[PDB]
Design a protein around this ligand. Structure first.
Ligand SMILES: Nc1ncnc2c1ncn2[C@@H]1O[C@H](COP(=O)(O)OP(=O)(O)OP(=O)(O)O)[C@@H](O)[C@H]1O
Ligand SMILES: Nc1ncnc2c1ncn2[C@@H]1O[C@H](COP(=O)(O)OP(=O)(O)OP(=O)(O)O)[C@@H](O)[C@H]1O
Ligand SMILES: [Mn+2]
Ligand SMILES: [Mn+2]
Ligand SMILES: [Mn+2]
Ligand SMILES: [Mn+2]
Ligand SMILES: [Zn+2]
Ligand SMILES: [Zn+2]
Lengths: 356, 348
DNA sequence: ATCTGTACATGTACAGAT
DNA sequence: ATCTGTACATGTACAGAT
DNA sequence: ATCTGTACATGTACAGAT
DNA sequence: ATCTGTACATGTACAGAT
């Protein structure tokens, strides 16, 4: 009940969806068209809509959209970066529009993102009917973020991605453990889909900085979010409703509200909660462990699980098991203890941050 | 217990499967080769394996195989023939054939018979034509008898015909998403060439959904993991095997049952699977109850003379027009007898 | 004349609105 | 409950190119 | 336009364990 | 008797090479 009313506050309004999507699609369509001009290295690039808005778990307002501009790259050869499992160098053994980004067979990610960025910036400059500008580059982002003032503020991340149709890198062999939940045929079919590489684009001063790419499974996450049940009819017009997505929304909202107040939580991001709930859905595969009538305890058990991840410094990437998103290397112990105490506080005082 | 030991004798043998498949594959591949590489009206025909063997519900022996040679055709007007639902005339390479099914099947048939004449490493002949069958049937012996149906099919990529709009009622079982996607696949047309002497029979085709039925057979649970290595086994397929066996044994013994076929059993269990969607209603521990409710369902179909095509709901496979009342009363008696006496026919 | 990248045309699951 | 906008998968038309 | 290579589904067969 | 784990077998989707 208390959580039904939060979900009501979190629910997007069709009026807002409608106006936000009309502008967002106008801009994206025009950027996609510019990428296909004859002399553009990005000709043939294709659009893939991803992220919470297209998974139907975007909360509060429709003000942040994510879209991949993906470019098929055949004859690709990968070299894992330092056994990290998620980061790779991308080699061409064959010698191509991607000429100008090569560095002796090694494909520079920052060179290709820069040219991509400049093209977008020019196309945005020629837009005169909507108030849209290109956000200052953020280190660690693979995105070119548009800031739209459809009066209200809207963010669109244009994510540059390489598309490889070969089999997935062996670092994922043990990843995606959906056999007991969505099953082996789903897993086999999912792993026949392409995998994606986006720029790491850190400026950490480490070797190979501007040539490191990072695996992306947004496409696979979108499928899972929209086909999330062990029963084929879960949340369908002739099936039973589950509360899997509602739990994701509540958890997203807890992290959003806290991050809004506390800059101690800057290392945390919504993908951490998304990852945590993929493990909980794997742990509790049956749709009856996500009955809408048990939203309270379903939310509670996800918090307990997240808390255990924080305290034990262990949140395995769902697709790359050997990659710990909560290792010391990425997030301070003190950053994790701070969030634990804040989560424990909300959990045991009626979630006062939901009332803000 | 009794039903387990029957399923054990119905189970195909891994060696028998290997020897028959490599010979069937030899013949089918050579036939397929001739239809395009040699420039004929069917250049571009593609192979689709169908039916009980490829659905893994073949019983007793790997002695019968069904293959579609499907051919893509665009802008084919589907005029439904006098509300039958399943039968259509086809209008607008294939210049030499209204697209007459009889004229196109006969050339198809002629090509296969020439190729079979040129096969010298396998004992294989072409069965004499059966009016009413869309198949070119091959008889192989190595030395075991194997029969292969080569089914000519037209492939259309448009919306399914309107007579199917209420068909395939899987929404509460496999769901709306599975259904929407299945109906995005092509649909197929195969020859009807009866000798009933009725009106437009020569130029008619019949809808085929063997591709959809294969998917269902192999994606038959309400849970995505049913019958997978990390899910629970159900007994849906074993019930189909048991009802197929009961009919096959009854048909061998009674000529009165010549108008029944295994596709009747297949259709009835599709309705049962829809009536009883939950995998737990097909637990292996309830094999007996499950088989019995299928029997009772099949008997109610006979009693009401009503067995709708799973994809074409206005097409009654049990209409008087197709099976006499007495044939259905006869079958009701034989099934009721086997049922009420522990199935003596299963022990022979 | 035919070919074909682009974009319209069709259908419906999802979920907000009433 | 029904009505209804967006997203998206796949079929098809055709201005402009060959 | 054709065909092999790959991965893992669907099966059968059976020893050891329960 | 069933369950489990390994071996053995064929069928099928599709990437990539020719
Ligand atoms: N650190 C990351 N590692 C891997 N994939 C990520 C990461 N951050 C984001 N992604 C991918 O990019 C998508 C979009 O990122 P974003 O941060 O917008 O979150 P979201 O899932 O869309 O949710 P929200 O924007 O509502 O907070 C994610 O859904 C995920 O697929
Ligand atoms: N009357 C029919 N109407 C529609 N489709 C049919 C009909 N008869 C057969 N088929 C299709 O053709 C396939 C081959 O039919 P066939 O008679 O060989 O039986 P089967 O299902 O393969 O089983 P079995 O041969 O083991 O008895 C069927 O599985 C079905 O898809
Ligand atoms: Mn987002
Ligand atoms: Mn984003
Ligand atoms: Mn058959
Ligand atoms: Mn047959
Ligand atoms: Zn659900
Ligand atoms: Zn099953």
């Amino acid at each position: 009940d208390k959580l039904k009313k939060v979900l009501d506050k979190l629910r997007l309004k069709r009026k807002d969806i409608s106006e936000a999507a009309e502008t967002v699609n106008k801009v994206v369509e025009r950027l996609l068209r510019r990428m296909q001009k004859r002399e553009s290295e990005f000709k043939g690039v294709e659009q893939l809509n991803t992220g919470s808005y297209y998974e139907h778990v975007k909360i509060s307002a429709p003000n942040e959209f994510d879209v991949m501009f993906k470019l098929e790259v055949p004859r690709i050869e990968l070299q894992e970066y330092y056994e990290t499992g998620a980061f790779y160098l991308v080699k061409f053994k064959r010698i191509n529009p991607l000429s100008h980004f090569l560095e002796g067979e090694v494909l520079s990610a920052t060179k290709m993102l820069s040219k991509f960025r400049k093209i977008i910036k020019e196309e945005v400059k020629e837009i005169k009917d909507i108030d849209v500008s290109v956000e200052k580059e953020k280190p660690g982002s693979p995105a070119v973020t548009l800031l739209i003032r459809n009066p209200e503020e809207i963010s669109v991340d244009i994510i540059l991605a390489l598309e490889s149709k070969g089999s997935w890198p062996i670092s994922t062999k043990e990843g995606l453990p959906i056999q007991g939940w969505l099953g082996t045929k789903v897993r086999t079919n999912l792993r026949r889909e392409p995998f994606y590489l986006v720029p790491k684009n850190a400026k950490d001063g480490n070797s190979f900085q501007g040539e490191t790419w990072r695996l992306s499974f947004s496409h696979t996450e979108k499928y899972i979010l929209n086909n999330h049940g062990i029963e084929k009819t879960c949340c369908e017009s002739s099936g039973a409703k589950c509360c899997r997505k509602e739990c994701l929304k509540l958890m997203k909202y807890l992290l959003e509200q806290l991050k809004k107040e506390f800059q101690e939580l800057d290392a945390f991001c919504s993908y951490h909660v998304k990852t945590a709930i993929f493990h909980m859905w794997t742990q509790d595969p049956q749709d009856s462990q996500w009955d809408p009538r048990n939203l309270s305890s379903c939310f509670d058990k996800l918090l307990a699980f997240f808390l255990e991840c924080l305290r034990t410094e262990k949140l395995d990437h769902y697709f790359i098991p050997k990659f710990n998103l909560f290792s010391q290397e990425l997030i301070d112990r003190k950053s994790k203890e701070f969030l634990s105490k804040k989560i424990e506080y909300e959990r045991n005082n009626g979630f006062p941050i939901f009332d803000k």
